[PDB]
């Protein structure tokens, strides 16, 4: 079973875990990968249901299971805010432009 699913991806918790702990450490380092410079700010213009406060940062979650280093980001993300507080699993999957739905 998925704890998350982004579209037709599938991630177990310790997918979130893993991705969010990388994400996170960048940030600390003043650091970022890719052409999109992940991580970089998240706004929350569509009002999901966040229960953590922000700033919210993106960084991706590869299907594969793999931490994302630069390369293709897919389309889905781990929000997670200045704290180290997870905010949720979202994914450009099945939303049009920029915009994003919850994975489930
Ligand atoms: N890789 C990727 N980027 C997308 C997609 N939809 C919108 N984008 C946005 O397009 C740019 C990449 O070319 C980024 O600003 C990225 O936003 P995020 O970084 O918030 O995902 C998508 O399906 N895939
Ligand atoms: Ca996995």
């Known amino acids: 079973a998925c704890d998350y699913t982004c579209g037709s991806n599938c991630y177990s918790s310790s997918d979130v875990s893993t ?10 380092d003043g650091e970022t990968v890719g052409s999109n410079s992940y991580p970089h700010k998240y ?18 979650i590869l299907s594969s299971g793999d931490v994302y280093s ?3 980001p897919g ?7 200045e704290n180290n507080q997870l905010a949720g ?3 450009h999957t099945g939303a049009s432009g920029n915009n994003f739905v919850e994975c489930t």
């Open 70 to 72: 630069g390369g293709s």
């Open 19 to 28: 991705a969010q702990a990388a994400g996170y450490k960048l940030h600390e």
């Open 43 to 60: 706004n929350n213009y569509q009002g999901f249901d966040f229960s953590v406060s922000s700033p919210y940062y993106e960084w991706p």
């Open 89 to 91: 699993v979202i994914t």
């Open 75 to 81: 389309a889905d993300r781990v929000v997670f805010n």
